Amino acid sequence: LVELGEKAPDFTLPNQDFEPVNLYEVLKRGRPAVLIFFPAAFSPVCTKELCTFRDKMAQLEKANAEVLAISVDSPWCLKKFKDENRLAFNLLSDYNREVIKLYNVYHEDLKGLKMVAKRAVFIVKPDGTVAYKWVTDNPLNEPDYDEVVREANKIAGELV
Template identity: 35%
Template sequence: MALAVGTKAPDFTLKTKTADGLKDIKLSDHLGKDQVVLLFFPLAYTGVCTQEMCDISNGLSGYASLGATVYGISVDSPFTHEAWAKANKITVTLLSDLNKTTTKAYDVVFLNLAGVGDTSARAAFVIGKDGVIKYAEQTPTPKDLPSFEKIKAALAK
């Protein structure tokens, strides 16, 4: 079960692939500056995950206007993320949790997805400038999307 609202969000350092190479992204770099939306998803190149990240990419300015930075997190490599993002025009910053340390810290592991192994569950967290979780949701199945209306409402508070 996902970490609860009111819990201090575990810090992390995850890799993303940029034009300049691999870059570290740290949650703690946002403290006192902006809110963060973490969108955990099972796997790149799957239908629901592609649709979710494409939809979020198309609406990124709405999150920015609410003072939030959005990250997509999965157990895929940063190189897979880069290829997937290019192929699908995904502009959300994608973070690689290849070792599943952040997925485990947020307690959103989906065990043995489709018989291929453990992945991130589909989950969403809103983290305030103070580093505390303001909204948390793990969907019942990987096919279900989080409530983006509730995410935006939490950001607006």
């Protein structure tokens, strides 16, 4: 289990370029780690009815932490996604549904698709403790990235 306080579970996933990425090895870099889980790339964000691809996810680049977006999509796909949105951070592929299970942030069956990453957000301190956590069961529910950026910088400034 993972929730406010508890220590975040280590893990390793491939990024857009198939380079393995270990969580603790990243926390070991000095800055906090922002983990963002999302259903699927090239997927729109909606409201009551209005759906668009206006995803301000690139604003997480403003945060003073190592951002790690994670979805069950493949590296080749995420790589495509990363390049098209000129995203500066890394996108990890949980193609084998490992992590989404480890962090208990998965949709049993979304629109027919089974085992999809839920929209979740975790901020882990350089030691390994979950300083922040946000999750919704509504997939078309885009997060407040500006928000996560604040909390991220807050937590970052915390370690002074």
